[PDB]
Ligand binder design. Structure first.
Ligand code: N66
Ligand code: NA
Length: 256
């Protein structure tokens, strides 16, 4: 069927995403251009939730100017009952793309890493720490990764494999928390698994993540600089962990 957003009509092609009280659709407009529309049902949303949604939308809209590695938001319509967000349509998200992948071109890997650093660096410059980065948060669009969201709105889901030690100990969050998560993503793109994927029991997995006696294996590989990045991102002490500005000057992303 169909949808109107700010007095413009969009034909639905198919659903491509879901999240409790939200759906994402591939759609075509009047000019037969393709877009993604994110729909959010507001019926059962408390005031804090509603405010978390408005806040994420405002940052997405603002950070449009600041980096092309953040997904495009062209328009939106917001009422008491719903939100419609007209966004860039991507080819596919990074989690799905990696899951149907035997191995990765080192060049493609390096190029995706750069994109991830750029996007996350950008949000950090505006005071935002995402704190739940996973491959699902990145969208492949025209051979590029774009960050889809900022971790601000309330709510594969609840996965613990990318969660840094300091997030587990809380019961503090800094930009370094996102570096760990990014490091888990790159480690996955390098070795085909997250660093604690072996441990099936979640409580053991949590205990391994915070245990400095538990050594994370970094098997040798051709690219020594890649191995070094992974070691530097996956320091349990956030004050010992490499920062994003430092990762952008690392030989892994700069050399050749
Ligand atoms: C993790 C981020 C997040 C946080 C909170 C709420 C949502 C909404 C569920 C979301 N997810 C999103 O907003 C999503 C999920 C997918 N997309 C978005 C935002 C806009 C968007 C734009 N293009 C796409 N392209 C796209 C992604 C995956 C696929 N898939 C390929 C087919 N396969 C079976 C898996 C899904 C196909 C696509 O386009 C054809 N996806 C999204
Ligand atoms: Na979010």
């Amino acid at each position: 069927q169909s949808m109107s957003v700010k007095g413009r009509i969009y034909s639905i092609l198919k659903q491509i995403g879901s999240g409790g009280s939200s759906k994402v659709f591939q759609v075509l407009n009047e000019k037969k251009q393709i877009y993604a529309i994110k729909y959010v049902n507001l019926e059962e949303a408390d005031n804090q939730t509603l405010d978390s949604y408005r806040n994420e939308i405002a940052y997405l809209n603002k950070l449009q100017q600041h980096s092309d590695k953040i997904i495009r938001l062209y328009d939106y319509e917001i009422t008491d009952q719903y939100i419609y967000m007209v966004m860039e349509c991507g080819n596919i998200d990074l989690n799905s793309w990696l899951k149907k992948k035997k191995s990765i071109d080192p060049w493609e890997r390096k190029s995706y890493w750069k994109n991830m650093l750029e996007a996350v660096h950008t949000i950090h410059q505006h005071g935002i720490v995402h704190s739940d980065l996973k491959p699902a948060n990145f969208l492949i669009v025209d051979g590029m990764l774009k960050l889809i969201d900022f971790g601000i709105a309330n709510q594969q889901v609840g996965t613990v494999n990318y969660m840094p030690p300091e997030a587990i100990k809380d019961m503090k969050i800094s930009p370094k928390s996102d570096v760990w998560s990014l490091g888990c993503i790159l480690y996955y793109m390098t070795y085909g698994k997250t660093p604690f994927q072996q441990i099936i029991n979640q409580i053991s997995k949590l205990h391994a993540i915070i245990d400095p006696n538990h050594e994370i294996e970094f098997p040798d590989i051709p690219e020594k600089d890649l191995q070094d990045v992974l070691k530097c991102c996956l320091k349990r002490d956030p004050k010992q962990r490499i920062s994003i500005p430092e990762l952008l000057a690392h030989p892994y992303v700069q050399i050749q």
